[PDB]
Ligand SMILES: O=C(O)[C@H]1O[C@@H](Oc2ccc([N+](=O)[O-])cc2)[C@H](O)[C@@H](O)[C@@H]1O
């Protein structure tokens with residue numbers, strides 16, 4: 001599977017594209033630079049990624065997948081609120097260049113309608129899973145009943161990316177009051 | 193004041209730089225492009241802005257100032273929570289290119305320690321005003337007493353930029369549940 005070509009080559013290209021985009025931004029990175037960084041000729045590269053847009057699309061889908069691993073399945077062994085607090089803390093401990101690239105894509109999205117639509121699909125898929133977990137907690141009497149789950153998930157996502165986008169978030173999350181304060185915020189959101 | 197040179201020229205340059213940065217990003221915009229966009233020769237431009245960094249510094253200070261206008265003075269005629277809900281809604285109705293540029297600077301900050309420090313100064317100045325308003329509400333029995341005001345302001349700022357960075361925020365804020373849901377989130381944050 002993961003060791004059957006062209007998957008290794010594709011993933012290597014994506015690693016090189018992730019590094020170029022994170023260091024210099026999407027706009028200023030050319031395909032030639034990605035060729036030079038990945039050691040792949042234009043011919044080979046274009047067989048696997050015909051455009052810069054195809055590369056960022058695959059990256060956004062990877063980011064989407066990482067987010068879904070947290071919420072795809074029903075929670076077992078932790079309350080919803082506690083899990084969300086821990087998830088936000090974990091966000092701050094992730095690969096820094098990966099976080100830098102998430103913000104770069106957010107920025108490109110504001111000025112690139114094609115990238116914005118990719119992010120809309122991403123947030124939709126994450127929101128769906130969050131609402132699914134809000135439903136479980138509600139059916140188990142964990143969260144309030146009169147909660148706009150869709151809007152709550154959108155606002156949780158906003159807070160999450162705001163934290164992801166703040167260079168001092170890893171330091172903030174070292175403080176116990178980050179968890180404590182975030183918990184009051186989220187229990188109010190989900191009316192606990 | 194505002195009509196005494198070089199202020200008009202400086203502000204025109206900043207408008208042109210705001211547009212170039214928002215449309216193409218900070219990294220890919222050269223001073224020559226800013227010269228061409230503002231109609232100012234390199235000589236004149238460099239007298240007022242010696243570097244790209246000087247331009248983004250002035251822009252960040254403008255953004256900082258806009259934020260402080262909301263929280264610099266004690267609130268009169270509205271509760272803290274209601275004011276914060278309305279502030280977040282207003283954020284979604286602001287100049288779109290201005291919002292795009294805020295996110296671009298957030299992105300550059302992740303990968304440019306010099307820009308990150310500018311943003312640290314910005315958030316510090318905004319946090320100070322928020323804490324000042326949290327203090328007033330607390331002395332007036334409006335918000336809870338056991339609130340980490342510093343951490344609460346940091347997390348409010350994160351949510352605010354997360355909303356500012358979401359292209360669908362203007363649509364979300366057209367829904368009454370955006371205000372309602374945001375209000376529960378913030379009353380939990382400030383333990384009301
Ligand atoms: O979406 C993304 O780009 C990021 O998602 C993160 O997971 C989430 C955790 C909590 C919430 N939340 O509380 O809303 C949303 C998402 C992944 O850890 C990160 O690798 C990825 O970059």
Ligand SMILES: O=C(O)[C@H]1O[C@@H](Oc2ccc([N+](=O)[O-])cc2)[C@H](O)[C@@H](O)[C@@H]1O
Pocket residue numbers: 255256258259260262276279280282283286294318348349352
């Ligand atoms: O900081 C910034 O760049 C932005 O600040 C905005 O004002 C704020 C409102 C509410 C909160 N909050 O609830 O934390 C923080 C800031 C200005 O409307 C916007 O023009 C500027 O771009």
